[PDB]
């Protein structure tokens, strides 16, 4: 225990030496983004209860959403139509995911099972291809590496990597003290980051199964995590009501986004395609569009009666989908 | 304007909408309760009609209730409890026999009652192991005054009447514990939710009837607030 304290001070001292200049000072002379105004271009209705999760498809036209109703339903964003309606066995689901190939979707809940559904089949029905079991806590996030492999973060302080065809964990990631709330895959997919209630975010190598780095700058739990499009940085959303940008290579937080007006927690975070705009969803029923480089709020998306649980920016970057507990998820452009 | 295949897709969406609405109407019939008790509570025993998350469905007087019991989760329940923020009532169970753990039960009740997400929902409190409490009080080896100093300075309310065949000091202990819980319940004073205490033995003929008439009371109060009568 004594040796760990000395090593911990070395890491903090090493980080202080590298931090020669603040990113705010580095980016003092850049054009302000200005005031951005985005009006809701759609409102997808049909969920009869609170919406917990939503994920965009790769084609950017289709998305899947999960709700307390106990049904997973896929939308056609452009035409508002419902492509599918999938009845879930368990009503409680905190996460859903869309495969990169669009062939499968995943759902995770309090039933300690991540269920993979085969959308494209003969006989014209969505059928559960597998039930992934082995976690001892609720599944907070699931993300597909490819059509075969899926990573799931759980409330048992342990993230896992599954081979869907085998159905058994091929790797397991154990470094967290609190329940894991979020998981964000990198653009290259070779590594990822996870978020937990211990107020720490850790970088895990997928193949090796080891924690490369850990970042701690949050007072409270972190609910959502999103990699920067470059893949060399990420941002985290906490109940402290501060959104912090973290750097993989530098190994220190570069900047924190906070306003005295908002003391309410952050439910979701996403990065614009260029990475300049950080869209943070809040329990105060309004998502705030943050200029990441300068950390000045440039716009507000205020059209939700209840809390925004979900936020997702399309792969093309055209549209922003925000789900919420009022059972309406609105696509903004 | 609209292609034939897109028109057929719209028809499919409309059929899906009708199926979703029918399923929601079916779901609206059932009233959903959250059963929680940390340990030694008898949560499996409180309701005998029906026998990661364990779901028990029982129906009394032509109304069907669904009861959720979760065992896996640890002491920190903040993140999964927010899912159960629409339940009609939360059934809390405590064991009055164990005085050492009773303060922990009171702290748990305070945390759940004062939870921000669960402000609206009421609580049905079952004080369990009534026969064990009576036996311990009769024996007198355990002193509630020791675990709870305030018990020595207490007077049973004259308005309340003990049931026949119950001892006076025993009833004093029962009403002391009930008042201790009800004080935490009434401290907030919001009035949107109420704690309803019930004393339950290890085996009781019908606690489902108690849950049923209590749920009638909660729905009645909600309707009175809705119509602006109260």
């Amino acid at each position: 225990r004594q040796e760990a304290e000395q090593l911990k001070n070395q890491i903090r001292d090493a980080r202080k030496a590298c931090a020669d200049a603040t990113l705010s000072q580095i980016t003092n002379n850049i054009d302000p983004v200005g005031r951005i105004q985005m009006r809701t271009r759609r409102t997808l209705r049909g969920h009869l209860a609170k919406i917990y999760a939503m994920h965009w498809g790769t084609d950017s036209r289709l998305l899947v959403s999960a709700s307390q109703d106990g049904k997973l339903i896929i939308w056609d964003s452009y035409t508002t139509n419902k492509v599918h309606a999938i009845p879930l066995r368990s009503s409680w689901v905190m996460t859903c995911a869309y495969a990169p190939s669009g062939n499968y979707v995943a759902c995770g809940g309090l039933d300690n099972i991540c269920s993979i559904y085969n959308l494209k089949t003969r006989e014209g029905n969505v059928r559960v291809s597998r039930e992934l079991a082995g976690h001892t806590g609720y599944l907070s996030c699931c993300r597909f590496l490819d059509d075969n492999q899926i990573v799931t973060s759980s409330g048992d302080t342990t993230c896992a990597l599954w081979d869907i065809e085998t159905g058994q964990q091929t790797t397991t990631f154990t470094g967290h003290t609190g329940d894991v709330m979020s998981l964000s895959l990198a653009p290259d997919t070779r590594l990822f980051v996870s978020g937990a209630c211990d107020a720490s975010a850790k970088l895990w190598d997928v193949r090796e199964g080891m924690c490369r780095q850990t970042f701690t700058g949050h007072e409270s739990d972190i609910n959502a995590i999103c990699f920067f499009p470059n893949g060399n940085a990420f941002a985290t959303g906490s109940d402290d009501a501060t959104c912090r940008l973290f750097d993989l290579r530098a190994d220190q937080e570069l900047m924190t986004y906070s306003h005295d007006n908002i003391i309410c927690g952050i439910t979701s975070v996403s990065f614009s395609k260029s990475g300049r705009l950080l869209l943070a969803g809040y329990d105060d029923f309004n998502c705030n569009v943050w200029d990441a480089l300068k950390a000045d709020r440039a716009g507000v998306l205020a059209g939700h009666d209840n809390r925004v649980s979900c936020l997702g920016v399309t792969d093309d970057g055209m549209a922003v989908a925000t789900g919420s507990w009022d059972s309406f998820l609105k696509i903004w452009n | 304007t609209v292609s034939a295949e897109d028109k057929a897709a719209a028809e499919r969406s409309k059929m899906i909408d009708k199926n979703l609405r029918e399923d929601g109407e079916k779901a609206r019939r059932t009233l959903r309760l959250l059963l929680l008790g940390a340990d030694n509570s008898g949560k499996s025993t409180i309701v005998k009609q029906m026998r990661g998350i364990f779901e028990t469905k029982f129906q009394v007087d032509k109304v069907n209730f669904h009861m959720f019991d979760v065992g896996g989760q640890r002491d920190e329940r903040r993140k999964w409890i927010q899912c159960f923020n629409d339940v009609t009532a939360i059934i809390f169970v405590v064991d009055s026999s164990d005085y050492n753990r009773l303060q922990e039960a009171l702290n748990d009740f305070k945390s759940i009652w004062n939870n921000r997400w669960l402000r609206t929902i009421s609580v049905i409190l079952f004080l369990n192991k009534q026969d064990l409490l009576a036996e311990k009080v009769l024996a007198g080896k355990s002193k509630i005054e020791d675990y709870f100093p305030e018990f020595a300075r207490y007077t049973t309310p004259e308005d309340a009447t003990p049931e026949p065949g119950e001892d006076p000091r025993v009833t004093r202990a029962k009403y002391f514990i009930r008042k201790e819980f009800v004080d935490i319940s009434t401290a907030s004073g919001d009035g949107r939710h109420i704690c309803y205490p019930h004393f339950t033995c290890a085996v009781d003929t019908e606690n489902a009837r108690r849950i049923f008439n209590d749920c009638k009371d909660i729905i009645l109060q909600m309707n009175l607030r809705e119509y602006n009568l109260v």
Epitope: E123 | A4, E5, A8, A9, E11, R12, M15
Partner: single-chain antibody, 228 residues
Framework: VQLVESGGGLVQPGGSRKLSCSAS????????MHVRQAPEKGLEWVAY????????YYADTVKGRFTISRDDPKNTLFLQMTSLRSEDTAMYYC??????????????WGQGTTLTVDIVMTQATSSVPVTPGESVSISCRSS???????????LYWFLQRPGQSPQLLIY???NLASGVPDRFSGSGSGTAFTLTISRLEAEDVGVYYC?????????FGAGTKLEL
């Protein structure tokens, strides 16, 4: 998945008959159902029934004399025929189809029962000689552009082997139906389309039909036969 067709046979002109196609192995409620082929001529679309029987269309040739009905719990589909005419002799096929984003309608076709008693799509050639292993191109023209404003172009390529019902090769002029080899490719311009078969082999020989789905009625081209 199977569609077995029952009923047919000789009928005196002016009589009535009812054909039944029974579905097994797939969710019959989800699939909107349909197509006849005369003994010596290409296919022609007869009727269409949506999911839940909400919408019905008939071809003008058979409108007012035919009646299409589906029994969802039994899964059977019926075509009730009245005032049978000499032109109505054909091989009647029961075809499934599902319409959502990314769907592949007309994917499966039934066996067929013999009965004895508008956008114009043209195929330039009725017959085309082929050799094994050599690229073959079949072209089908359209009177009107099949490209809708949304970007989809509704051309379908169907292949009928000898002694076999038609099967879907390409849907919407580019997308390749599942279970079909990657040799078949669909290239298409506005009002002019082509199907290219590369490295042709035996069992890829048959009549290739081009269909439009921009608007009802659905018109089939006469189709270009391949002969080795």
């Amino acid at each position: 998945v199977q569609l077995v067709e029952s009923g047919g046979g000789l009928v005196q002109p002016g009589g009535s008959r009812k054909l039944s196609c029974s579905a097994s192995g797939f969710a019959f409620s989800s699939f909107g159902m349909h197509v006849r082929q005369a003994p010596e001529k290409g296919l022609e679309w007869v009727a269409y029934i949506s999911s839940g029987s909400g919408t019905i269309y008939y071809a003008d040739t058979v409108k007012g004399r035919f009646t299409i009905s589906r029994d969802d719990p039994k899964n059977t589909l019926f075509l009730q025929m009245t005032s049978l005419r000499s032109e109505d002799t054909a091989m009647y096929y029961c075809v499934r189809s599902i319409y959502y984003y990314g769907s592949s309608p007309f994917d499966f076709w039934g066996q067929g029962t013999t009965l004895t008693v508008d956008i114009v799509m043209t195929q330039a050639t009725s017959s085309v000689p082929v050799t094994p292993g050599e690229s073959v191109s079949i072209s089908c023209r359209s009177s009107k552009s099949l490209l809708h404003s949304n970007g989809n172009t509704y051309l379908y390529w169907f292949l009928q082997r000898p002694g076999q019902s038609p099967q879907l090769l390409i849907y919407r002029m580019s997308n390749l139906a599942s279970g079909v080899p990657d040799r078949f490719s669909g290239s298409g311009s506005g009002t002019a389309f082509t199907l290219t078969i590369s490295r042709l082999e035996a069992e890829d020989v048959g009549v290739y039909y081009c269909m439009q789905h921009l608007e009802y009625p659905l018109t089939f081209g006469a189709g270009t036969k391949l002969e080795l």
